[PDB]
Design a protein around this motif. Structure first.
Motif, PDB file in Angstrom:
ATOM      1  N   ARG B 146     -56.505  58.453  14.197  1.00 57.22           N
ATOM      2  CA  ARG B 146     -57.950  58.596  13.995  1.00 57.22           C
ATOM      3  C   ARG B 146     -58.578  59.760  14.775  1.00 57.22           C
ATOM      4  O   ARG B 146     -57.978  60.265  15.682  1.00 57.22           O
ATOM      5  CB  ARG B 146     -58.609  57.294  14.456  1.00 57.22           C
ATOM      6  CG  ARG B 146     -58.444  56.143  13.360  1.00 57.22           C
ATOM      7  CD  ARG B 146     -58.904  54.774  13.825  1.00 57.22           C
ATOM      8  NE  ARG B 146     -58.181  54.387  15.011  1.00 57.22           N
ATOM      9  CZ  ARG B 146     -58.333  53.236  15.629  1.00 57.22           C
ATOM     10  NH1 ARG B 146     -59.190  52.313  15.159  1.00 57.22           N
ATOM     11  NH2 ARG B 146     -57.610  52.996  16.688  1.00 57.22           N
ATOM     12  N   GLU B 150     -63.557  57.131  17.305  1.00 58.40           N
ATOM     13  CA  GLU B 150     -62.910  55.904  16.851  1.00 58.40           C
ATOM     14  C   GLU B 150     -61.498  55.606  17.349  1.00 58.40           C
ATOM     15  O   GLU B 150     -61.087  54.446  17.412  1.00 58.40           O
ATOM     16  CB  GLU B 150     -62.904  55.846  15.306  1.00 58.40           C
ATOM     17  CG  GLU B 150     -64.278  55.688  14.715  1.00 58.40           C
ATOM     18  CD  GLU B 150     -64.938  57.009  14.380  1.00 58.40           C
ATOM     19  OE1 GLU B 150     -64.293  58.089  14.593  1.00 58.40           O
ATOM     20  OE2 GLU B 150     -66.143  56.947  13.916  1.00 58.40           O
ATOM     21  N   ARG B 160     -52.609  51.614  15.472  1.00 56.43           N
ATOM     22  CA  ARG B 160     -53.181  52.978  15.391  1.00 56.43           C
ATOM     23  C   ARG B 160     -53.511  53.548  16.773  1.00 56.43           C
ATOM     24  O   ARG B 160     -54.083  52.849  17.623  1.00 56.43           O
ATOM     25  CB  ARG B 160     -54.457  52.970  14.543  1.00 56.43           C
ATOM     26  CG  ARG B 160     -54.130  52.789  13.047  1.00 56.43           C
ATOM     27  CD  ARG B 160     -55.363  52.717  12.143  1.00 56.43           C
ATOM     28  NE  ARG B 160     -56.155  51.545  12.460  1.00 56.43           N
ATOM     29  CZ  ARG B 160     -57.399  51.333  11.989  1.00 56.43           C
ATOM     30  NH1 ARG B 160     -57.946  52.206  11.144  1.00 56.43           N
ATOM     31  NH2 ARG B 160     -58.077  50.229  12.336  1.00 56.43           N
TER      32      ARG B 160
END
Lengths: 267, 272
Positions: B146, B150, B160
């Motif tokens: 990302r 974020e 992530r």
């Protein structure tokens, strides 16, 4: 006193308030018109010369671009007082480009001496100044001896007017190639040592790049390029002060007051 | 396991497991001896959010691309008012003009600057370019997914923008000290780590004067505070790598730094 510095509405009153000797040029780069105070008298450059040492390096790198990536060793024995960046790298080396940044934004004195070695010393810096059209400013010594000043000894001095014209030609004009002058401007914009000097007196309408200088006796200087954030022509402002009867801190106050008066003059 | 963690319980902890219990958190550490390859640590294979520690690898990615296009480091990228994020200590000064890629690299390593990181993602091909660089370097665990801000978010089971202590330690060894980059690139990256300004209260606060330290911190507004570092012995010899990842939401943000400083003290005792 502090009150008299803050009340001063013009440069002469400001000089009288600190019982010192003040030299100022405010230059409008659009017109060429200048507003000055003792602008043709000599003052010691102190660390303001580092702006032009860096420019000398960039000018040499235009003919040999690998110069900026060359690494120079930093030894413990080379450390001087006020060497905040190079002290972290003692026993190893740094690129010439990172030495330039360090000597401008933290005024690192060891970085400066190493760069003098790389470019050919005070004569190289003087040659670059002459080549740029400045027949007044001169570099003669290394750190920390260059900070010494005596009336009538022109070593390592400039005048407010000469340095203002040189800042205009080198930072804003065609002495350097665009990439080089933009790199130099960015370092001046990132300066960390000037928050209590001209910047303290200038309003939010200006992006400021500056370089300070001082010695341990009575001198405190700041030279700056002011870009209007809204767009338009930049102004150049140089300020040199000798005032042994007030404190180091109060000398910054005088420079902040120069910035306030200048901001009113520009309108 | 502490019901009411205090500063005193934290500074009294003498091993990683006891330090974790004292702050009622989850602590992941890897201490790596680059000369023998041995590791000492805690939760070394569990995933933690990288937060800003990923910027070390974003800068390495830029340098790796620039080896093939050297003018890339001198390319100037505009900084727009619209690009500015909450933490933009350097790029805020240049809004309305531009900055070189190299100076953006410096800013994102040595300050909290998040706008610089997003501008650099634009230059390199985004999070996927950073992940591809990591895979080619041999890291199969770390991943960039990302943009800022974020990427600083974390949820159990969502991988992530995570790494593990062991994976990041090995990657720092290969990238900062090994042969993934050319010598001039790796030295520039080491110099930026050595010049870091955000880490004085973290690992460096616990490490003795015998080490020259380069590091990169990372944190978020929830419970994560991290610091990864390369320790070079001033007297000479083989460097050590130390990665520390902490989640500790029961203590304050400032106390999370104290926990990392204590990791530094413990590590210094273990190296002997």
């Amino acid at each position: 006193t502090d009150a008299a510095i803050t009340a001063a509405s013009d440069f002469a009153a400001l000089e009288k308030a600190c019982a010192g000797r003040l030299g100022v040029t405010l230059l409008d780069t659009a017109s060429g018109r200048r507003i000055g105070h003792r602008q043709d008298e000599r003052f010691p450059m102190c660390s303001t010369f580092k702006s032009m040492l860096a420019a000398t390096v960039l000018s040499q790198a235009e003919r040999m671009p690998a110069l900026l990536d060359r690494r120079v060793p930093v030894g413990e024995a080379d450390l001087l007082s006020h060497a905040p960046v190079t002290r972290r790298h003692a026993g190893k080396d740094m690129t010439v480009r990172d030495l330039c940044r360090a000597t401008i934004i933290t005024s690192d004195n060891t970085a400066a001496n190493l760069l003098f070695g790389v470019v050919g010393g005070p004569p190289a810096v003087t040659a670059f100044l002459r080549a740029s059209g400045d027949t007044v400013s001169r570099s003669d010594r290394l750190e920390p001896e260059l900070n010494s000043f005596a009336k009538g000894d022109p070593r390592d001095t400039t005048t407010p007017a000469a340095m203002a014209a040189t800042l205009q030609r080198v930072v804003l004009g065609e002495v350097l190639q665009p990439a080089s002058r933009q790199q130099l401007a960015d370092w001046l914009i990132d300066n960390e040592t000037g928050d209590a000097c001209l910047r303290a007196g200038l309003g939010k309408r200006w992006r400021v790049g500056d370089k300070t200088g001082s010695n341990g006796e009575d001198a405190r200087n700041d030279i700056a390029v002011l870009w209007p954030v809204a767009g338009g022509a930049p102004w150049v402002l140089t300020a040199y002060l000798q005032a042994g009867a007030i404190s180091y801190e109060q000398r910054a106050s005088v420079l902040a007051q120069v910035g306030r008066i200048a901001d009113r003059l520009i309108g």
